[PDB]
């Protein structure tokens, strides 16, 4: 019913909601002091400054055709229809009067404080070839250009704050943050943008819920319990509005448990509504749009009077309401606007930025179309409404006017028709001595720049900042898990303790004993040493070998000195010397068996252990054979033993030339020395032939022992037979000991050395005893 119009060469338009939705009966209720009149006077003052700016639009003066929507849908449609009715070709339908004003083309439709009115106006204006920029439209619904082509909001929508949230969360190194939103459409699209940005930044999300506004405190208690009942982090996200955030903080205070969280534009400052719960909100950072006060607009609005400014009837009704009176009584002149303080909101900056952006776009297109003329050229008389928006409105580079010199805004429009946003981060500072109040730490113009010293918990003096890591980093140890599902944050799980880090997810083993100092490279069996057996354990074998060598030398010296004895004269003196030499060679083989193990070492030890045994066995066999043949030539007896051992020599030589040993170490346990123990030759047919030859020699000795009627040296023959039986028993015992210790590492070698040393010592002392009785005793 009321329309504000201003005469101008290129008149613009405006849709500012001055009233609110009253109900089904009444059209709209009383005017609002904050969102309906102050923004209207703001855009009026901005347009007046535009008309009085010599550098901006000098030739053409733009007007205004502003309408009120009463914060409704059908009313918004009916009022926005006038902007197009003024632009219709026919204008007025032909009709016959039962018994004036001419339509003026409108270029700009700057307006829209709510979401539904802006959606409807953009839907109506997208197809009528007319641009429309908004100042307060934070819903993500007007983002798809397919549904809203001509729309360039100067305010950043709430879903752009997801980038600032991700920047904040990555600045403090937080991963397992939780979040909470509302069941409304704006809440769900904002939280969806938040999840999208978090996935782009690879940030985990603990829980995601939508809390309502028409629920009691029981539902809020339940949802906060479901949020804090899964403890893996201390940081949360609060994306809901202030009306719900107040009750959420009250419920959190009822839990007597507080933590840190980030807040969206709903809880930017909002200090008066949530002042009840001061303990729960002790540590928290919020997000608030940058709104610098305008000294020019404030001075203009403070000096407004209906008598001097009567071109705005809505302003007259606002003056009547704010200073309740009646024009019939003429008591409104006594009331003064300077008596009550003036409170500026955050949308005056947006309306002035929008009108200045449109003025700059008009100036740019006028300079690019007809720069020779300063007034509207004939080509610019009809406004296209589409190129002006696509090429000039969207691609604008004007600086924000009416701002302090120390601050720089530089608001612009992106390809999606959205204004560049500057967000100031407000944190709740704890002030026990004084009163709790907020504090600005940084801004989000282009990149996140905030100081951690101003933040209490972020400052190192108060303590370490709270973390949101679901797990703690582990050192060069058990590998990280590769379980799916929970791939947002990682956890390293224990492996077998005998494995290294092959990769970031593979847990293999490449060598024990030495810890690799490198990260992943470096794999070797073991830096083995030359000697592995301990000195204390090897002392026994060395002492036994020394005692055996000393006993053989004493027996050889006694036989050499007592060479004229009748017992040694009628016996094998050369055979006795050969047996003494073979017994002395047994101590050398036992000592060599405990030397540095290697290929040549193992072959030499095996060859010596075989040769000494074969030599003594052949000697005793020849002795018993002669004793059984004579009692029932020395060259032949000396050559037959060589011919006998030649078979074993050829056998071992053939086995040596048939199988070449190496240095291949195979370890059954997961943690053991890779040092060579005895040799590379495992259990094969080599030990079978030697065991068969030893068994045949023992059987031949036992068969030759069958004689028992020896009249000469009967005691010596009995001692030799007892020694042969003892050696056979020792070999039989060593065979089961070697069979049981077939898997032992060094115990088998120690037992074999002890057995061969004991057999050699017994064979030496058996013959040394008769010599001792003959000479020493």
């Amino acid at each position: 019913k009321k329309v504000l119009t201003l005469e101008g060469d290129l008149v613009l338009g405006g849709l500012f909601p001055v009233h609110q939705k009253g109900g089904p009966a009444e059209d709209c209720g009383p005017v609002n002091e904050h969102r309906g009149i102050q923004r209207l006077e703001a855009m009026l003052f901005a347009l007046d400054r535009i008309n009085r700016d010599p550098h901006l639009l000098p030739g053409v003066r733009l007007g205004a055709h502003i309408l009120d929507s009463c914060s409704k849908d059908t009313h918004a449609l009916e009022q926005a229809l006038d902007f197009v009715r003024a632009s219709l070709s026919r204008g007025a339908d032909g009709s016959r009067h039962i018994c004036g004003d001419a339509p003026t083309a409108i270029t700009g439709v700057i307006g829209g404080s709510y979401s539904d009115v802006s959606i409807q106006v953009a839907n109506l204006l997208r197809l009528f070839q007319i641009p429309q920029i908004s100042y307060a439209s934070t819903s993500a619904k007007l983002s798809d250009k397919s549904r809203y082509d001509y729309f360039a909001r100067t305010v950043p929508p709430d879903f752009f704050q997801a980038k600032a949230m991700a920047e904040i969360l990555r600045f403090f190194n937080w991963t397992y943050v939780s979040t909470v939103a509302s069941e409304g459409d704006y809440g769900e699209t904002g939280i969806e943008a938040f999840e999208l940005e978090a996935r782009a930044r690879n940030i985990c999300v603990a829980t995601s819920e939508k809390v309502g506004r028409a629920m009691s405190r029981a539902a809020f208690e339940g949802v906060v319990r479901a949020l804090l009942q899964k403890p893996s982090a201390r940081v949360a996200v609060l994306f809901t509005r202030s009306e719900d955030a107040r009750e959420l903080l009250a419920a959190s205070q009822r839990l007597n448990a507080s933590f840190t969280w980030v807040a969206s534009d709903g809880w930017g400052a909002l200090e008066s509504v949530v002042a009840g719960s001061e303990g729960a909100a002790e540590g928290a950072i919020t997000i608030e749009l940058a709104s610098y006060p305008i000294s020019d607009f404030a001075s203009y609005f403070q000096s407004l009077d209906p008598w001097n400014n009567s071109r705005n009837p809505w302003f007259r009704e606002f003056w009547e309401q704010r200073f309740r009176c009646s024009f019939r009584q003429r008591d409104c002149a006594a009331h003064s606007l300077r008596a009550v303080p003036f409170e500026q909101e955050s949308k005056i900056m947006f309306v002035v930025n929008a009108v200045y952006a449109m003025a700059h776009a008009l100036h740019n297109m006028h300079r690019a179309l007809c720069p020779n003329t300063t007034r509207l050229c004939d080509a610019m008389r009809p406004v296209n409404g589409r190129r002006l928006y696509k090429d000039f409105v969207l691609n604008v580079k004007f600086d924000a006017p009416f701002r302090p010199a120390d601050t720089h805004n530089e608001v612009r429009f992106d390809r999606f028709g959205d204004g560049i946003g500057r967000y100031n981060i407000f944190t709740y500072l704890r002030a026990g001595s004084g009163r709790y109040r907020y504090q600005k730490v940084g801004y989000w113009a282009e990149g996140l720049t905030l100081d951690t010293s101003l933040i209490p918990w972020a400052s190192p003096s108060a303590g370490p900042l709270p973390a949101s890591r679901c797990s703690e980093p582990c050192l060069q140890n058990e590998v990280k898990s590769v379980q799916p599902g929970e791939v947002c944050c990682w956890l390293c799980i224990p492996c077998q303790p005998y494995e290294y880090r092959l990769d970031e997810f593979t847990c293999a083993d490449c060598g024990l004993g030495y810890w690799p100092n490198a990260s992943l490279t470096g794999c070797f069996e073991l830096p083995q040493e030359y000697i592995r057996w301990g000195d204390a354990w090897a002392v026994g074998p060395v002492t036994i070998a020394c005692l055996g060598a000393l006993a053989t030398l004493f027996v050889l010296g006694v036989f050499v000195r007592h060479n004229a004895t009748p017992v040694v004269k009628a016996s094998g003196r050369e055979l006795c010397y050969i047996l003494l030499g073979g017994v002395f060679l047994c101590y050398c083989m036992t000592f060599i068996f405990i030397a540095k193990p290697s290929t040549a070492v193992c072959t030499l030890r095996r060859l010596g252990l075989g040769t000494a045994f074969s030599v003594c066995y052949s000697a005793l066999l020849t002795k018993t054979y002669r004793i059984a043949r004579i009692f029932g030539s020395p060259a032949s007896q000396v050559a037959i033993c060589l011919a006998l051992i030649s078979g074993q020599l050829l056998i071992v030589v053939a086995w040596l030339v048939v199988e070449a040993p190496g240095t291949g170490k195979e370890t059954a346990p997961e943690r053991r020395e890779v040092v060579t123990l005895r040799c590379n030759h495992r259990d094969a047919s080599m030990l079978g032939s030697l065991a068969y030859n030893v068994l045949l020699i023992a059987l031949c000795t036992l068969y030759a022992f069958k004689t028992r009627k020896c009249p000469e040296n009967f005691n010596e023959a009995k001692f030799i037979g007892f020694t042969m039986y003892t050696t056979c028993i020792i070999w039989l015992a060593f065979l089961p000991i070697f069979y049981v210790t077939s898997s032992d590492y060094r115990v088998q070698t120690t037992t074999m050395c002890v057995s061969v040393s004991l057999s050699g010592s017994v064979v030496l002392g058996c013959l040394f005893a008769p010599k001792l009785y003959i000479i020493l005793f």
């Binding site: 229809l81 009715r85 070709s89 007025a92 339908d93 016959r96 039962i98 018994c99 109506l124 997208r126």
Partner: protein, 792 residues
Amino acid sequence: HSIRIEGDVTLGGLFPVHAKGPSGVPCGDIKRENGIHRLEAMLYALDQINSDPNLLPNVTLGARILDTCSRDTYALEQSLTFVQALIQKDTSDVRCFVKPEKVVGVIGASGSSVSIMVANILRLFQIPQISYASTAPELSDDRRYDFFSRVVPPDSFQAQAMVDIVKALGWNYVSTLASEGSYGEKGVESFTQISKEAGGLCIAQSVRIPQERKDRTIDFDRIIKQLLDTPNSRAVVIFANDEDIKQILAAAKRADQVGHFLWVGSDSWGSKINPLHQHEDIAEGAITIQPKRATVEGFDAYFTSRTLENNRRNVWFAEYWEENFNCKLTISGSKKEDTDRKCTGQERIGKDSNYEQEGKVQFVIDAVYAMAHALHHMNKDLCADYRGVCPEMEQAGGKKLLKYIRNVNFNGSAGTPVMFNKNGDAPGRYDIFQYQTTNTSNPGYRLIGQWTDELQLNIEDMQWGKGVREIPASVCTLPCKPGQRKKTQKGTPCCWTCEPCDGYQYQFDEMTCQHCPYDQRPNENRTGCQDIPIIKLEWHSPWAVIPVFLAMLGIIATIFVMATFIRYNDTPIVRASGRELSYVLLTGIFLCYIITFLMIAKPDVAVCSFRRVFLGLGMCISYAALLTKTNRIYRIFEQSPTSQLAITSSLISVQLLGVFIWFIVDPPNIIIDYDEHKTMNPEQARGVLKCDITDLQIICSLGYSILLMVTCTVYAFKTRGVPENFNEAKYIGFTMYTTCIVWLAFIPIFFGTAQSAEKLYIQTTTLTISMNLSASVALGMLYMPKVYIIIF
């Protein structure tokens, strides 16, 4: 000039009686026949609706017809003219006052692009739009157009019909072909969107048709070439207009391709003769779709009895006669200088003009009827107790009207029913057209079947019908399913290379080939590792005949030695020798023969439970008699049969406890087959099996006999020195030496024989033959003296 018809409730109308040829003026002077045959049909629908007592008897139905010639602004102005009268404020304009009427809905939105721009503003207000000729399917969504209801099926329904007709016609892959800048682009987009989700449908190729230049025909020659590049692809769907369809068919005709790929047309093709002329090869198999083209006899009856005196309701019919065969009107306009003949005197020239009612003509009558039925439902549910129209219509909204229009299931002008889905789209009632020249000579489009919700067509409608509906059904290659395949798909969609898997693995459900457990191998079909009975070593002719005969020949010797053993006790020759020695030798020979014959039987769990000790007992029993003989001749040679029997029993007891010990090591079981050969057609290969008998066990069992043979040879070396008793000691020594030589050769056969997979049928046979030969030699040497005594 709009059309005003009096009525309590009126409906909107957007009909293109003009053209958008000249861009300077909003609408061209020329008119279109398709756009002029629809608004008269709506007028007939309205004047027939407000004429009967069964449809809106108490309220008359008005009309508000406006022209929209498919312009971005003029059509927008005419559509905005509806909501301007709804508000009708008009408080600023003063001349020196009229009665406005609200509109309940619109039966306009003829053009595809006009529907979007009309519904975008009609969504904001409470006025629906019931389109009739819209083709673009992107407006079928409810989130962007919730006040829209199409009476014709969109292109998405056409794509669904194409999917259903391709799935039910054999082939699964089809090369799509559409033209951009028209409904073809949206049609192919919907086709891909609905085929990606569809299971069993494949896309062979996707090519665009450029509409910038078609007179050169240089692109169409290249398109048909690259379409033939892909193998066995004979199905192609066309969503473009007829203009380039004629050119592509002409190109396919002049090219004379060897592939002869069948064509699939769209609603643009339908059943027209224009594109093809004397083209039989390219027309064969051109299965094309077309919606139900009904004819309303009432509209034809009303459109013949028209005059310039009674048809004064519409303003465009006066100038409509200018589109006839060069005739004009002089009552209002000025005659042209080219022709002065007048056609107002008679209307027979219109009948002679051979006009035909378009298919979209009956699509504006059912829309008006549906809105009238929605208004009737409104009246019945709100103000069914009023004399005329109730005031509850002006204060109502459009939401209830949309809800009442959605649940509309009445029978329209023709015999087919009309209904709307949840998105405001009517179900697709298409007719399948195929060109055939073999059954009839005249050009025809004989109908196959109807497509309303399912496929009710004639599979055998074609004359051949043998395999022509299955020739393009392929897997990108020849069909390969003989029972041994492996479906490996990489890169190429809905296709896999016809390649078999390894011979050691059998397929499972034609998906993958896996390995079966040991002793099993895939059959000739590579479908499953079947089970077959193992082979047997009984009655083998090629090689076992000689050892079988050698073993059977010992029965006579065993029977002769048994009867001679306890017999002839009077002669001193048998009295000098040990009586138990001959019996022990006979028992050993019998045990050796039984052990040799036991190898013929197939071993089992219970067989080798007692056969594992029969072989070892036979060898040790034979050496006992020789040892006893040497002991006796050594005791007699200096300067006891009872003790010999005890020594033999102790030697056998040493072997009995031994075999018990080496048997208690593992339970008696059967071993699996040992082979590393490939798989052939006889899946039942040579599966030789036995109990726990290996080379080490055989060596340990035969080790005891080696020492006995060595001792016997050592004793015979000295026994042969002194010849006595008819050189019996010399014969015993010769027999012992022969036995030792035979045993030495047996060790070389079982040593180093690792280059033969038939060892179980060769080495055991050779060992048994050697043992039988040694036993026969011993028996012949022992029984020689008895034979000589019996002869002499």
